[PDB]
Amino acid sequence: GPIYARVIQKRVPNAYDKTALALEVGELVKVTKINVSGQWEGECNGKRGHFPFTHVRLLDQQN
């Protein structure tokens, strides 16, 4: 299940940033690779990469 994570604090890192999500405060990253800790791999409508739970507020993965 991919969650929708309302990212409340992110930078603009391309897939060249060891493949990171280029997204921003207030945006939405749909994590297609989930975990328990919050260090998952995210996909934001065309951006693929990985980031932590530290600065995201996410809706569920069953939705």
Domains of the chain: 1-63 (2.30.30.40)
The structure was resolved experimentally with NMR
Q: Please say whether the beta carbons of 13 and 21 come within 8 A.
A: yes
Q: Please say whether the beta carbons of 19 and 49 come within 8 A.
A: yes
Q: Please say whether the beta carbons of 13 and 46 come within 8 A.
A: no
> What residue type is assigned to position 62 of the chain?
Q
| Max Cα–Cα distance, the chain, nearest Å | 30
Provide the token pair at 53.
Answer: 């739970």
Find residue 62's DSSP bridge partners: none
List CB contacts of 36: < 8 A, sequence separation 6 or more.
none
Strands (DSSP E) contained in 1-63 are 3-7, 27-33, 40-44, 47-51, 56-59
Q: Please say whether the beta carbons of 58 and 1 come within 8 A.
A: no
